[PDB]
């Protein structure tokens, strides 16, 4: 009855760590996504019709 209740006090504090971590990762996701959105718009300008049509003789690679 000591060990089981001291485990409940352990599980209370665990929440704090969990909230603290979760938040950090969530703002990181938003930041990274925006950087993709700007890069995508420049790609959009070039892709805009008309464009030269060609054929690839070979890829050296």
């Amino acid at each position: 009855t000591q060990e089981l209740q001291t485990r409940a006090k352990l599980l209370d504090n665990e929440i704090r760590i969990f909230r603290s971590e979760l938040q950090r990762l969530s703002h990181e996701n938003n930041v990274m996504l925006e950087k993709i959105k700007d890069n995508k718009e420049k790609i959009k300008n070039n892709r805009q019709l008309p464009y030269l049509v060609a054929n690839v003789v070979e890829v050296m690679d």
């Binding site: 019709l49 008309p50 464009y51 030269l52 049509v53």
Partner: peptide, 16 residues
């Protein structure tokens, strides 16, 4: 006709 259009110009230049 491609579901745009491929034109062929008389100088033989291809464009969508």
């Amino acid at each position: 006709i491609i579901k745009k259009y491929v034109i062929n110009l008389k100088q033989i230049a291809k464009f969508v």
